[PDB]
């Protein structure tokens, strides 16, 4: 789902893998390591700051 | 099946039949003796 995040001056470093697209492709799914859990990154996701 | 099947194939054709049938769904072969059993099982539990 598209996401719009305000107040970027308090940027959470948790988006660093997301912004860098440090994705992992294995088994046909796209895996992103957000924090310490793996989430299937849907291709339709988009984030705005 | 309702309960997960237990295949008894001494000759080894059912095992290769299973690979062919479920190849399109990215089926992976593991074993109880392998140490990667935990991570392989967990991955299936999350992503089919």
Q: A22-43 burial by CB neighbour count: b if 16+ within 10 A, else e?
A: eeeeeeebbbbeeeeebeebee
- φ, ψ of residue A19 to 5 degrees: the values are -70, -35
User: Minimal Cα distance from B23: which residue of A?
Assistant: A27
> Alpha helices of B1-48 — where are they, by DSSP H?
14-21, 37-47
Eight-state DSSP code of residue B35: T
**A25/chain B closest Cα distance in angstroms:** 12
C-alpha span between A11 and A42 (Å, rounded):
23
The three-class DSSP label of residue A26 is strand
**B30 Cβ under 8 Å from any chain A Cβ:** no
Number of inter-chain CB pairs under 8 A, A vs B: 8
**A26/chain B closest Cα distance in angstroms:** 10
Pairing type for strands A29-34 and A37-40 reads antiparallel
User: Minimal Cα distance from A31: which residue of B?
Assistant: B47
C-alpha span between A18 and A48 (Å, rounded):
12
How far is CA B28 from its chain centroid? 6
Method: cryo-EM
């Amino acid at each position: 789902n598209p996401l719009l995040v305000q107040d970027v001056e308090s940027y959470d470093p948790v988006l660093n893998p997301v912004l860098n697209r440090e994705v992992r492709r294995t088994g046909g799914r796209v895996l992103i390591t957000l924090g310490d859990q793996d989430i299937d990154l849907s291709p339709s996701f988009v984030i705005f700051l | 099946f309702n309960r997960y099947p237990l295949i008894i194939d001494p000759s080894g054709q059912a095992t290769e039949f299973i690979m062919n049938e479920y190849k399109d769904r990215k089926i992976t072969r593991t074993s109880f003796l392998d140490d990667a059993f935990r991570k392989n099982l967990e991955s299936a539990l999350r992503f089919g």
